[PDB]
Design a protein around this nucleic acid. Structure first.
Lengths: 164, 131, 88, 86
RNA sequence: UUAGCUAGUUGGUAAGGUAACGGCUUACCAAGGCAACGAUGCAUAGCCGACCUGAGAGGGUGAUCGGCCACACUGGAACUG
RNA sequence: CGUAAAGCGCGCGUAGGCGGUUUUUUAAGUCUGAUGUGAAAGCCCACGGCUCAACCGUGGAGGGUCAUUGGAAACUGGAAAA
RNA sequence: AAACGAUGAGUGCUAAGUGUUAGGGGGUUUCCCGCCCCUUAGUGCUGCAGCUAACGCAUUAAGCACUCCGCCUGGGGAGUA
């Protein structure tokens, strides 16, 4: 949905596998690679793709990445509040942090959060250690994240009476 | 035999969120009316309307939904449940979601939101978070 | 067995008032009659499963209600136990 | 000296089969370090009567007195509730 | 895969004894007491303020330092004070 | 705790755990304030002194499932009434 | 015992349609017994939300919760000593 090449971008690869398809006779393989894409100013998205070679596969993953996009509700260089991500036993848990701390997380989720423009944030992976599921859970957590203005409009009252 | 009415009301509320229906029906109680009033005062409840028939209740509430039909909260649950009752001091009282959410808590002077309970420096037994 | 005739006859003397039909005194009495009946037939037929299951369920319920009347009132327990000659 | 209002512990009686002595069962409920719930565990305080005044099943409170015998210390102060089969 | 333990035991009386209360010890009378909310046994172990670790709840340890307890080749006893 | 280890074959039921609705009441839990106490050293904070640091000192906070006592009664609990 | 639904018991809530077993209320028929709708409880299937490693579960939840009980913490050893 609505891929844009107009903003600045930073490609970032998480993992590459050598993945095989067995047939009679030989043994056919096709490389795979997942990528995350964001402009590190409040917008992010992941990506997947497969091909018989590295550069073509990662290009496919990136061109499919911009098509799925994330608004990344951010505040003060940190997430507005603390949450728990869950997707297919790939659980994950994030929590805001005082400035100067920095993103601490696993490699893939560090890349996800560093590339979404968050500076200081606390988190720890849980459950499964495979990059794909925990990355998708991280993005799912960012999808159901809200900020003060995103809620104050909904409830009849306003900000400055309910605030972080 | 029903072990807990608060569990019933919160399950009814969440199960109303999952299908989105403005009206719901549930046997009322004094604590139930008070917490419904505070729910309306936060802004999550469009309207409140108690009714009377033999004998209790039955409390009818009107839900709230965004213009794009978006559920206001992202989760709702209790803390004080039977067997393991819980309590909370005035300073130790937790800030769930900070301003974002609130923390219903029952006190020696009555049930109020999390804020006023920390302002007055009087704690009590928490009941349910909401956010 | 039991029969509605003898049941309705005996409950009139044990009912707390004319109009009532609950009043576990009534229930304890009819249960006692029932347990004696089933116990006589179970001595007549030694082996079965529905009979002893039933006897156990009704004895449990009778004890539960008898204990209930032990906290609502204190003389009623006594007058029933020494009138039915039960709960030694 | 007069500085203690002695530790007054209500409880009930369990037996009366010894001279001038009873076995008060004090009751309280205490927490758990790991969890935060409550559970009640009983005790059996033996007690010094004057003429076996207390009954079986009675409700009474007691007080610290002094070591009076082999593992019996408290004396009665006031019988609270006395009754027959309930 | 430690379920019954306890007969001075538990209670009383009397006396003695102890700085003191106390089956603490004697003689008499009574049969109680302890135990699933874990007695008793077995096995190990001095305890604590703390130390290490952990975000936190927790987990492990009881080296220095301080407090308390127990012991001085092994067992028994008592004088002095 | 379907299939991966993990619901006993099931039943009757003690002790226990949990508890429908409303009112009054108690204030045990709970909340709240004070009092005494939680030795000192130690951990943390702040400062000072050994050339600095290590270290040490000072003072503070912190530390109870703590006791006494002044208040509250929504909730748990006790009593009484629907 | 593969005693199984490889699904502990009790309670409450959450789209549907289609049947089957023993009932009930109402309208349509001169008479419903002929027809329909509605309500029960079990007894099935297809399926949405949601949930799951996936398969599948879906008011007869493996969903949304509460109380209580049982149990597991790698395989072989071994149900063995």
């Amino acid at each position: 949905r609505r891929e844009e090449e107009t903003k600045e971008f930073e490609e970032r690869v998480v993992t590459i596998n050598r993945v095989a398809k067995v047939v009679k006779g030989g043994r056919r393989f096709r490389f795979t690679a997942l990528v995350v894409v964001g402009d590190k100013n409040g917008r992010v998205g992941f990506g997947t793709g497969k091909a018989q070679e590295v550069p073509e596969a990662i290009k496919k993953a990136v061109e499919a990445a911009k098509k799925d996009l994330v608004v990344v509700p951010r505040v003060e260089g940190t997430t507005p509040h603390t949450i728990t991500g869950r997707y297919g036993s790939g659980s994950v848990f994030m929590k805001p942090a005082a400035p100067g701390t920095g993103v601490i997380a696993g490699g893939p989720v560090r890349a996800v959060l560093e590339l979404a423009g968050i500076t200081d944030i606390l988190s720890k992976s849980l459950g499964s250690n495979t990059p794909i599921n925990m990355v998708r859970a991280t993005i799912d957590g960012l999808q159901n994240l809200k900020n003060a203005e995103d809620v104050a409009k909904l409830r009849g009252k306003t900000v400055e009476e309910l605030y972080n | 035999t029903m072990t807990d009415p608060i569990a019933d009301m919160l399950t009814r509320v969440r199960n109303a969120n999952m299908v989105r229906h403005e009206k719901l029906e549930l046997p009322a109680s004094n604590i139930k009316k008070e917490i419904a009033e505070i729910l309306k005062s936060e802004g999550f409840i469009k309207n409140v309307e108690y009714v009377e028939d033999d004998k209790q209740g039955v409390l009818r509430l009107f839900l709230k939904y965004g213009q794009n039909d978006e559920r206001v909260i992202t989760g709702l649950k209790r803390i004080s449940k039977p067997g393991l009752r819980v309590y909370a001091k005035a300073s130790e009282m937790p800030k769930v979601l900070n301003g974002l959410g609130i923390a219903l808590v029952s006190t020696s002077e009555g049930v109020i939101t999390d804020k006023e309970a920390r302002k007055r420096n009087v704690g009590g037994e928490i009941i349910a978070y909401v956010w | 067995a039991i029969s509605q005739e003898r049941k309705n006859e005996i409950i009139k003397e044990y009912r707390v008032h004319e109009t009532d039909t609950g009043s576990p005194e009534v229930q304890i009495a009819v249960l006692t009659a029932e347990i004696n009946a089933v116990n006589e037939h179970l001595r007549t037929h030694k082996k079965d499963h529905h009979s002893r299951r039933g006897l156990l369920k009704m004895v449990g319920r009778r004890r539960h209600l008898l204990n209930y009347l032990r906290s609502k009132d204190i003389q009623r327990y006594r007058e029933l136990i020494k009138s039915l000659g039960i709960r030694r | 000296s007069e500085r203690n209002d002695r530790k007054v512990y209500v409880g009930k009686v369990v037996s009366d089969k010894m001279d001038k002595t009873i076995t008060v069962l004090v009751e309280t409920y205490k927490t758990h370090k790991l969890y935060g719930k409550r559970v009640k565990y009983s005790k059996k305080y033996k007690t010094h009567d004057e003429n076996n005044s207390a009954k079986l099943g009675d409700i009474v409170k007691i007080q610290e007195t002094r070591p009076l015998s082999a593992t019996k210390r408290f004396r009665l102060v006031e019988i609270v509730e006395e009754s027959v089969i309930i």
